[PDB]
UniProtKB/Swiss-Prot annotation:
Positions contributing to Zn(2+) 1 binding: 82, 118-119, 236
Associated clinical condition: Genetic variations in PDE4D might be associated with susceptibility to stroke. PubMed:17006457 states that association with stroke has to be considered with caution.
Active site (catalytic residues): 78 (proton donor)
Protein's gene: PDE4D
Source organism: Homo sapiens
Residues bound to Mn(2+): 119
Parent-protein start and end of this portion: 385 to 712 of 809
Post-translational modification: Long isoforms that share a conserved PKA phosphorylation site in the N-terminus are activated by PKA through phosphorylation. Isoform 3 and isoform 7 are activated by phosphorylation (in vitro), but not isoform 6.
Function (record text): Hydrolyzes the second messenger cAMP, which is a key regulator of many important physiological processes.
Protein name (record): 3',5'-cyclic-AMP phosphodiesterase 4D
Length: 328
């Protein structure tokens, strides 16, 4: 009735779940490549989500396992480890003091469940690739947020497998609210929605409102869901805000993917995508490009919304940013 030494080493690593920069890769290793399941389960236990939502634990694990097994292990970046990381990062963002007691349990469950499934069954190529190659997925979803529609459809479809309906006890109301929210969040993970997401977020910041003991005031779905979308979006692009040790493995993995994608593009006639070009790609320039133009403005804006909560995070990102500049 006692944990194995591995289960234990694994538990201690998990003692870090509330902290930015958990070593998710070790956990991936320690758990036999179940980082998504153990972290999810840890988070679910930790937030008491099973009781609150009457989620049977065996059902929770079955779904978790099923879900994790639908990420591709043969995909360098968009796999269950990335899933797990985004989950845990979202987890941590939700705990930010500026948000204390702001969101309901259902909104938390949505944010976390969204993060868990937001890339599920990712082929490791981009929307544009899928579109240009005339792939089933692209045709299924009429070229619009192809991947993200697919992650959702799969994440929800997996609830129907044997003993997988983790939401079997929620009322229709809870379920419809959860579903809509989860959909709005995962749809907002599409990079082409970035600029708009940020705009709104800056606007939230600009037309800011706080209330009692100083935590964001949000008295409508549009505002609530926008913060959640930006939150999970931030987690999705949180890698450059992690300790360089983490950041670099993530860059390795993303670059492996882009290069592999550029490999399929180069042969299949297509002109090697942006930054995907093998040998002709500067990873260090691309990381500065990405940080300066996309990642920093997102996190700076997010940091404002939650000032001073995200300061260490934003600082890490700037350190990491300058670092890559060393590599020039
Ligand atoms: C060469 C740098 O590329 C990326 O890192 C990178 C992403 N990676 C991440 O999910 C976060 C990370 C930061 C560092 C390692 S992983 S998402 C993305 C890019 C290129 C520009 N994009 C974009 O604007 O549109 C694509 C649809 C989408
Ligand atoms: Zn995605
Ligand atoms: Zn992602």
């Amino acid at each position: 009735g006692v944990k194995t030494e591995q289960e234990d080493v694994l538990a201690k690593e998990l003692e870090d779940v509330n902290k930015w920069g958990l070593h998710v890769f070790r956990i991936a290793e320690l758990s036999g490549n179940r980082p998504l399941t153990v972290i999810m389960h840890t988070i679910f236990q930790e937030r008491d989500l099973l009781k609150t939502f009457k989620i049977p634990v065996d059902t929770l694990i079955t779904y978790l396992m099923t879900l994790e097994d639908h990420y591709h292990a043969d995909v360098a970046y968009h796999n269950n480890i990335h899933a797990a990381d985004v989950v845990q990062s979202t987890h941590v963002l939700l705990s930010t003091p500026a948000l204390e007691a702001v969101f309901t349990d259902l909104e938390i469950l949505a944010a976390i469940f969204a993060s868990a499934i937001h890339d599920v069954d990712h082929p490791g190529v981009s929307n544009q690739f899928l579109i240009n190659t005339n792939s089933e997925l692209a045709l299924m979803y009429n070229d619009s947020s192809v991947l993200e529609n697919h992650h959702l459809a799969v994440g929800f479809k997996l609830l129907q497998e044997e003993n997988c309906d983790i939401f079997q006890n929620l009322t229709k109301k809870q379920r419809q609210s959860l579903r809509k929210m989860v959909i709005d969040i995962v749809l907002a993970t599409d990079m082409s929605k970035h600029m708009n997401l940020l705009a709104d977020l800056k606007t939230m910041v600009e037309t800011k409102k706080v209330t009692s003991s100083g935590v964001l005031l949000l008295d409508n779905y549009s505002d609530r869901i926008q913060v959640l979308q930006n939150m999970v979006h931030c987690a999705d692009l949180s890698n450059p805000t992690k300790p360089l040790q983490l950041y670099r493995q993530w860059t390795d993995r993303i670059m492996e993917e882009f290069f592999r994608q550029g490999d399929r593009e180069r042969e299949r006639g297509m002109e090697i995508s942006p930054m995907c070009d093998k040998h002709n790609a500067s990873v260090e320039k691309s990381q500065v490009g990405f940080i300066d133009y996309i990642v920093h403005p997102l996190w700076e804006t997010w940091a404002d919304l939650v000032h001073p909560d995200a300061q260490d995070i934003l600082d890490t990102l700037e350190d990491n940013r300058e670092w890559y500049q060393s590599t020039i």
